[PDB]
Structure 1
Amino acid sequence: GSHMRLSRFFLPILKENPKEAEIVSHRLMLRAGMLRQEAAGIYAWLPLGHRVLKKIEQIVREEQNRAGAIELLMPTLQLADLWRESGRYDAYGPEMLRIADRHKRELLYGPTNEEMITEIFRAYIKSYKSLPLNLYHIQWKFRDEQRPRFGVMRGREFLMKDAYSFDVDEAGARKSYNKMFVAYLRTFARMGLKAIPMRAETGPIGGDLSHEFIVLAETGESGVYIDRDVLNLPVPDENVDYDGDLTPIIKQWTSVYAATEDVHEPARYESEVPEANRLNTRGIEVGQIFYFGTKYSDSMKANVTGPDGTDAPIHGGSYGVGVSRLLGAIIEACHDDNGIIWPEAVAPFRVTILNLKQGDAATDAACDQLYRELSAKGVDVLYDDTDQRAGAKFATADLIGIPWQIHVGPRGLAEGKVELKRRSDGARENLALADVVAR
């Protein structure tokens, strides 16, 4: 289990708030040594930030696999011609970064991957028997956003797990859509986020199949109207049967009202949601599921032979989690006046060890000992071993958001004890040096 010492690390703390940051999470990612802007909307992820980014990446992956989706990797650069096949090339917009290689071939930095995935599908898959199929990757995208803004939350280069489903009819597709809906409730739950499924902007297709998963915040960009009972709903444990019928679970979440400003009916809101249960607020879109049937398979001629032996365009859906952007949501949703409060499951380190008289023989040895014992039992452990006063060490440990602190000085070591602090709520428990490892 990974383990670092600050004096061997790279963690550039900024004492003061950077002018260029408006919302709290940007403001905090910069001070917490997690980020550097390289161009507008384009970020280097500094060591601490990358660790968090990796953890979010892993969780998202685990839930995709748990739901049966298969991981591959598509390239950043796509041919224009591919996009011409589907009629999105000129249609997508100026946010698509266009590139010309040395041979004047037209490529773009992919903002997304429907055409590409379809291309891949039609090259290999021929019979209804291979389906359902859910193919996904976690990969960098570009949208030449008009005003790159809010640090990681409206950037231009950004990390997204995008998933793509392939079914025989609308029936199978809605089944695949359920699978991802469930996978998503779990995903966000595992990140200490209550993200709410909300019916969101459908295309010319109509119907019900489109949901944005939204975390609530007054700082947020998307506006919402919700029946508060939805904040209390339970999130399927890890044993959910994904070959089964999730309609129950889906009904449990769609039954109660949930909508964004785009598809909101005042006349239906008033008809379903009791006066006191209503809440008009805003939120942060962290995930997005969208069923698009034969939109791509038509133009691209991605067909399979049905269970009656005739060729049909496949029905598909796509499912995106804003991986890089979660970093910004998680912090908005998890901070206080002292800085970040990482949920355990996404923190860059589980515990930091703080030396309150660094250089003194006895405490230095106790730190080493805990450093090494916590290391051996697969715990992510930073040991702040810098030549710096307790006060400085607290402000940083608190700033960077590590879930547990361990305070170690000659004081407590006198009666053979260390202070353990739980960041989220300030809980503290002066403890015996020999017990703390027992978590």
Structure 2
Amino acid sequence: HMRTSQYLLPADAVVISHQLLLRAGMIRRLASGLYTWLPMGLRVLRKVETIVREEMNAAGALEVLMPAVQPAELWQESGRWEQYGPELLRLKDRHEREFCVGPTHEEVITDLARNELNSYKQLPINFYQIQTKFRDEIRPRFGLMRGREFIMKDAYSFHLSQDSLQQTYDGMYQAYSKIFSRLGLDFRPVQADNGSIGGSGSHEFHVLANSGEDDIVFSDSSDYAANIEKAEAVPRESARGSATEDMRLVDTPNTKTIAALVDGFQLPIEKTIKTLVVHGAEEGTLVALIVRGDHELNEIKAANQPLVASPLVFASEAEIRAAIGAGPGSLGPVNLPIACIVDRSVALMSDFAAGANIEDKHYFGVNWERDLPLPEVADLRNVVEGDPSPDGKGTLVIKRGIEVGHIFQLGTKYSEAMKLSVLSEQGKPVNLIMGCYGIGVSRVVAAAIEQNHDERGILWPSALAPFQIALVPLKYETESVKQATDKLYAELTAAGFEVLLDDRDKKTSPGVKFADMELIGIPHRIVISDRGLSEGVLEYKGRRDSESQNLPIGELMSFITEKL
């Protein structure tokens, strides 16, 4: 008998999921980013794991279990030993051999693949695991959301052709949809950054919650959906305005922000531009990226520009001063001695202000072609709320998302570097084309609470509830109650329901018991008492019900079976 004598058990906790996971006796902190699953919490995790496993299996993926401790030599082959960065936990064994604790498993599976895959007849094939990762998050926080040790489902698929990858990638995308549907989450798949302008080689899956760290973008009139990183921006204006002012050089002291320029000289913000200087791909060069004053530079879009070094490095003040002859706050496209790219919206601007590339000065009345030639145009900005959908169908809305899934097309990145090759039917060597697919299993648990909670505590989706029914007997010590209760437990448990019986003594009031069952998020409660048994009635309340109701002892099993 699962009893409450066994199972039940701030300041550091800021987000709701962290607070309620602690209070509901689901997890306990061991150290920074390291949490034990308590008995109640583990039940939830297992239900997530099961559903994930079920759908992965149904999509044709084969479950493996790879080691956490991995030899550095494999990581040196991929170059990620160095390149992965300080989240990689590195160590040495007693023989001074070097290893990491796995943040992910691309290298391990690739090593497996090149030893186990030696025929085209084995392909396509998709391996996955549900296994504990380590990532040395610099500032572990938000409970399970940014842990160091966490549970991930990671899958890896191997292919002979790009078309074969697409099929599996689609099937994985479809499997993710089912998973998150069955977990009863309000979620969305979105386009994500694949490291190029255009393409659909990456997708994310987000639990919609107001605490989400990602901004995700949807058309209100189409299927368009993307992370703001990936979301294409097109201008609200259809044409460039005609020149109505002459360009003039103006003294602008203490004017190093858009706000200073707007308020100082009573300009509309739509008539100002920012110039950000970044390193170019060509050694020792700089590029100027220009967005409108009320817009932000998208750093993903910036880096993805051929001309711009990837990853993105902003120029130092000294670099900018040596190159241009003035500093941030006084920069612009007029008499600019470095390469320049302007945003689509900037290209349609007119009679606009800009730094003069002379300290504490701006040009007003700048017009393209008349005053200077228009530089290369590109999509450089973040979309904003209400912008046109880039597919040409509707306007954009911006919601917050908690990423719980992320899929990728890898190409031959790993297969080239680690020499994973298979002979085709024709006998031509083929570097295997690869995809990989990840779900933050432990993040999912937290994300469910972020989305689903109330003032009484956790509201589980039905598939995640640790127990289905809570039996609350009043003065279980009385033997008449303690026979009805135990009969009830037996029947319900026999009918294949998960039941928790509150076995606690009189020192725990019925009120506290009711609060705990709701805090933990049990969807159904039944109350037994002498008063109730006398009249042959049981008291039943739903988790999201306003008031309790009385049910005849005989008709409960039929009633409860309906609810569940």
Equivalent in 226, 229, 247 of residue 262 of structure 1: 229
Equivalent in the alignment of 2:126 = 134
Structure 2: runs of 5+ lacking an equivalent? 236-386
Equivalent in 433, 437, 444 of residue 326 of structure 1: 444
CA shift, 1:206, in A, is 5.9
CA shift, 1:226, in A, is 1.3
Question: How far apart are the structure 2 equivalents of 1:427 and 1:135?
Answer: 49
Deviations 1:333-380 (A, max 9, x none): 111110011112111111111112332222221111111111112211
Larger radius of gyration: 2
Q: Does 1:288 align with 2:286?
A: no
Question: How far apart are the structure 2 equivalents of 1:393 and 1:195?
Answer: 33
Question: How far apart are the structure 1 equivalents of 2:167 and 2:34?
Answer: 37
Deviations 1:198-225 (A, max 9, x none): 1112135962110010111221111111
In 2, are the aligned partners of 1:23 and 1:150 still within 8 Å (CA)? yes
Across the aligned residues of Structure 1 and Structure 2, the Cα RMSD in angstroms comes to 1.7
1:184-195 map, 5 Å: 184-195=176-187
Secondary structure of 1:386 counterpart: coil
Question: How far apart are the structure 1 equivalents of 2:79 and 2:112?
Answer: 18
What amino acid does structure 2 have at the position aligned with 1:100? K
CA shift, 1:132, in A, is 1.1
What amino acid does structure 2 have at the position aligned with 1:340? I
1:222-301 map, 5 Å: 222-228=214-220, 256-267=223-234, 270-271=388-389, 272=391, 278-301=396-419
Equivalent in the alignment of 2:366 = none
CA shift, 1:309, in A, is 1.9
Q: Is the alpha carbon distance of 1:47 and 1:290 closer, same or farther for their aligned partners in structure 2, counting shifts above 3 Å?
A: same
Secondary structure of 1:369 counterpart: helix
Equivalent in the alignment of 1:6 = 4
Equivalent in the alignment of 1:414 = 534
Secondary structure of 2:94 counterpart: coil
CA shift, 1:406, in A, is 1.1
In 2, are the aligned partners of 1:11 and 1:46 still within 8 Å (CA)? no
Question: How far apart are the structure 1 equivalents of 2:171 and 2:102?
Answer: 26
Q: Is the alpha carbon distance of 1:48 and 1:200 closer, same or farther for their aligned partners in structure 2, counting shifts above 3 Å?
A: same
Equivalent in the alignment of 1:310 = 428
Equivalent in the alignment of 2:487 = 369
Equivalent in the alignment of 1:174 = 166
CA shift, 1:429, in A, is 4.2
Equivalent in the alignment of 1:402 = 522
1:59-70 map, 5 Å: 59-70=51-62
Deviations 1:119-152 (A, max 9, x none): 1011011111111101000000111001101000
Secondary structure of 1:153 counterpart: coil
Structure 1: runs of 5+ lacking an equivalent? 13-17, 230-254
CA shift, 1:264, in A, is 1.5
Q: Does 1:94 align with 2:214?
A: no
Question: How far apart are the structure 2 equivalents of 1:279 and 1:355?
Answer: 50
Secondary structure of 1:304 counterpart: strand
In 2, are the aligned partners of 1:195 and 1:215 still within 8 Å (CA)? yes
The structure with the greater share of residues assigned to helix is 1
Deviations 1:270-323 (A, max 9, x none): 144766x64212110001111111111111111112132211011111111101
Question: How far apart are the structure 2 equivalents of 1:205 and 1:307?
Answer: 34
Farther-moved stretch of structure 1 (259-268 vs 394-403)? 259-268
Question: How far apart are the structure 2 equivalents of 1:298 and 1:60?
Answer: 31
Secondary structure of 1:4 counterpart: coil
Q: Is the alpha carbon distance of 1:72 and 1:197 closer, same or farther for their aligned partners in structure 2, counting shifts above 3 Å?
A: same
Q: Is the alpha carbon distance of 1:83 and 1:426 closer, same or farther for their aligned partners in structure 2, counting shifts above 3 Å?
A: farther
Deviations 1:4-37 (A, max 9, x none): 1112x1321xxxxx12110100000000001111
Question: How far apart are the structure 2 equivalents of 1:401 and 1:173?
Answer: 41
Q: Is the alpha carbon distance of 1:350 and 1:184 closer, same or farther for their aligned partners in structure 2, counting shifts above 3 Å?
A: same
In 2, are the aligned partners of 1:357 and 1:389 still within 8 Å (CA)? no
Q: Is the alpha carbon distance of 1:297 and 1:98 closer, same or farther for their aligned partners in structure 2, counting shifts above 3 Å?
A: same
Q: Which runs of structure 1 show a deviation greater than 3 angstroms over 4 or more consecutive aligned residues?
A: 271-275, 424-429
Q: Does 1:346 align with 2:346?
A: no
In 2, are the aligned partners of 1:217 and 1:282 still within 8 Å (CA)? yes
Farther-moved stretch of structure 1 (302-311 vs 264-273)? 264-273
Equivalent in the alignment of 1:248 = none
CA shift, 1:425, in A, is 4.3
CA shift, 1:426, in A, is 4.5
In 2, are the aligned partners of 1:227 and 1:273 still within 8 Å (CA)? no
What amino acid does structure 2 have at the position aligned with 1:414? S
In 2, are the aligned partners of 1:357 and 1:390 still within 8 Å (CA)? no
Secondary structure of 2:401 counterpart: strand
What amino acid does structure 2 have at the position aligned with 1:406? I
Question: How far apart are the structure 1 equivalents of 2:144 and 2:172?
Answer: 24
Question: How far apart are the structure 2 equivalents of 1:424 and 1:148?
Answer: 33
- Percent pairwise identity: 50
Question: How far apart are the structure 1 equivalents of 2:396 and 2:500?
Answer: 44
Secondary structure of 2:200 counterpart: coil
Q: Is the alpha carbon distance of 1:177 and 1:216 closer, same or farther for their aligned partners in structure 2, counting shifts above 3 Å?
A: same
Question: How far apart are the structure 2 equivalents of 1:406 and 1:361?
Answer: 18
Equivalent in the alignment of 1:335 = 453
CA shift, 1:228, in A, is 4.8
What amino acid does structure 1 have at the position aligned with 2:186? K
What amino acid does structure 1 have at the position aligned with 2:491? E
Equivalent in 74, 78, 81 of residue 82 of structure 1: 74
In 2, are the aligned partners of 1:165 and 1:318 still within 8 Å (CA)? yes
Secondary structure of 2:416 counterpart: helix
Question: How far apart are the structure 1 equivalents of 2:190 and 2:488?
Answer: 46
